């Protein structure tokens, strides 16, 4: 990955990326994109020097995006869920969908609908945890029940054993770096096995995934530009548009629009989908519209805290008004409400930013800038 | 409708690993004693113990976190250090001293000062140790220490900032080491035969010095 090249190169304390004399130079555009993406992960600072998080990424051998989740996962014993997640995306999708099954027989399609339903319990609006559901469920399937479990759920078996092996090695990598006994850690199956994540753990789990794909966050069009596209209750979920954060504003805003995939859990929702959705990537597949590979839904304040580390988030001046006094401690310390802005700056009309809900937060003047510390 | 209407955020492994320098690297290892005190209570003090113990166990069991009980069969108060609750190693001894002060004759609230602080001691001595007084001579000495209506004893208590229990010819003084000492000379001076009035004058002098410092 071009981000790993710059990341390893920056951990080498090498300042000039763009003009470096590579024997085989990567194109300047990707090198620039890598720096911005690697900044979005909070590993480079605003002057493009490696931070403490970035140095840990240099130690991790995976892609810098998958470097980020594991590092920030060391809280509330949610690691096995993240490891189970990261293994699934790394290998691929274990779900044989209805279109692949050619069932888009009425009794067979109906079994396919239940099989998805049992794995849908973790979260209504999210697909990445349905991946978690099968991976964790696989651990409790005995050896003699695999193929029956495989055939019953329309899942790919040989892919599944891969996930279990990938979970094993991956846990060793993060434990080695995070744990003080780096080399001495030995992985065990019991560690991988775990029970249902709690609601707080689920929310804790959605925001960890955001730490990786903070750039890949999409807003409903009806939020950012009311009436730009006609949205109403009768519209199906797959036809509800969304806009990426860093999409360049076209003369016609419909070009930037991106839509949910039918296979996603959100399609069978019926109710209105999330105002923000987190997507692994976008796919031109499907002549009608560009589709999402959606992972999980994030709220306003959760998104703000994740992009707080990154440079994709900007804060306004202190708010004043009814019950909005800005408490001040020192010349370089204060407590007030601020409306965070995620994405492009208001001045920057090329890229498409938006404003988040106002939240209590702590700032300190560093280098003449009220750097944010923590949300109150 | 009213008719007035309008219109939260973010087993030891049995093996070793050898590192590049050849060193071994192992896994992390897996991640107040019971004591008792006996103090017997004499007969004359137990009725005070009965009606007062409603205020004696709470500080011991709560603040000192001691395990309290008494033996009716042996007529003794018992305190034990509970290993799973007790935290202060000195609490058990501290509780014993507080019980002892009540046993010697001090008031309960007076004895609580032993629990509240760590620097209170009981000084004890006897009249014949000062001077061999017998018959009426001994009785007059005891009266001189107490004074009319106990005024002389209270004068010493307030001036030297201590307490005195005058049990017949048996004297106990409770307070800080220097404070209890100051009381002794005033008591002893009375035993040797100093009139109470002259003694009272010296109490006023030392009391002023106490306030100054």
């Amino acid at each position: 990955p071009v981000e790993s090249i710059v990341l390893q190169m920056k951990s080498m304390a090498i300042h000039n990326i763009i003009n470096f004399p590579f024997p085989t130079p990567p194109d300047r555009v990707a090198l620039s994109k890598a720096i911005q993406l690697l900044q979005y992960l909070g590993a480079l600072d605003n002057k493009e020097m490696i931070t403490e998080d970035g140095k840990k990424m240099s130690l991790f051998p995976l892609s810098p995006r998958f470097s980020k989740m594991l590092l920030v996962s060391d809280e509330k014993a949610c690691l096995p869920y993240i490891v189970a997640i990261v293994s699934a995306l790394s290998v691929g999708d274990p779900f044989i969908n209805e279109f692949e099954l050619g069932i888009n027989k009425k009794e067979l399609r109906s079994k396919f609908y239940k099989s998805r339903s049992q794995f849908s319990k973790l979260d209504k609006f999210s697909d990445v945890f349905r991946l978690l559901s099968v991976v964790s469920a696989m651990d409790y399937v005995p050896k003699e029940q695999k193929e029956i479990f495989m055939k019953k759920n329309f899942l790919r078996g040989k892919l599944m054993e891969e996930i279990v092996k990938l979970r094993k090695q991956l846990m060793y990598i993060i434990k080695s770096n995070t744990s003080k006994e780096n080399i001495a850690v030995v992985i065990r199956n019991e560690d991988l096995k775990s029970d249902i994540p709690s609601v707080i753990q689920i929310k804790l789990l959605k925001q960890m995934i955001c730490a990786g794909f903070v750039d890949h966050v999409a807003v409903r069009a009806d939020v950012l530009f009311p009436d730009d596209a006609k949205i109403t209750n009768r519209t199906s979920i797959i036809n509800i548009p969304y806009i990426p954060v860093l999409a360049t504003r076209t003369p016609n805003i419909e070009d930037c629009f991106v839509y949910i995939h039918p296979t996603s859990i959100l399609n069978n929702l019926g109710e209105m989908p999330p105002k923000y959705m987190l997507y692994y990537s976008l796919h031109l597949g499907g002549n009608n519209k560009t589709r999402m590979n959606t992972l999980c839904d994030i709220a306003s304040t959760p998104l703000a805290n994740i992009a707080r580390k990154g440079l994709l988030l900007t804060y306004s001046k202190p708010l004043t008004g009814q019950g909005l006094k800005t408490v001040n401690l020192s010349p370089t310390e204060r407590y007030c409400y601020v409306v965070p802005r995620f994405g492009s700056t208001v001045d920057n009309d090329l890229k498409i930013g938006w404003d988040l809900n106002p939240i209590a937060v702590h700032q300190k003047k560093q280098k003449g800038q009220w750097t944010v510390i923590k949300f109150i | 409708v009213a008719p007035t209407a309008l219109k939260v955020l973010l087993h030891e492994s049995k093996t070793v690993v050898v590192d590049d320098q050849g060193k071994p690297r192992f896994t992390s290892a897996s991640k107040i004693k019971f004591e008792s005190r006996k103090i017997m209570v004499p007969p004359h003090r137990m009725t005070p113990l009965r009606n007062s113990w409603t205020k004696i166990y709470p500080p011991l069991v709560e603040h000192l976190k001691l395990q309290v009980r008494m033996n009716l069969k042996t007529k003794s108060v018992e305190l034990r250090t509970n290993p799973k609750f007790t935290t202060d190693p000195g609490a058990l001894q501290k509780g014993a001293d507080f019980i002892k002060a009540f046993t010697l004759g001090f008031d309960l609230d007076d004895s609580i000062a032993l629990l509240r602080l760590d620097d209170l001691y009981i000084e004890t001595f006897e009249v014949k140790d000062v001077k061999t007084l017998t018959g009426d001579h001994l009785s007059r000495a005891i009266g001189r220490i107490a004074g009319k209506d106990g005024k002389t004893k209270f004068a010493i208590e307030n001036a030297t900032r201590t307490r005195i229990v005058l049990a017949d010819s048996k004297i106990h003084i409770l307070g800080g080491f220097t404070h209890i000492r100051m009381a002794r000379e005033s008591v002893v001076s009375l035993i040797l035969g100093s009139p109470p009035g002259k003694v009272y004058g010296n109490l006023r002098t030392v009391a002023s010095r106490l306030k100054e410092r």
Binding site: S133, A137, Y140, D195 | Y57, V61, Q67, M70, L72
Partner: peptide, 13 residues
């Protein structure tokens, strides 16, 4: 699986 009286008069107190 899911994925699929005076205190202490005579006694210790």
């Amino acid at each position: 699986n899911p994925w699929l009286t005076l205190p202490g008069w005579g006694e210790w107190a």
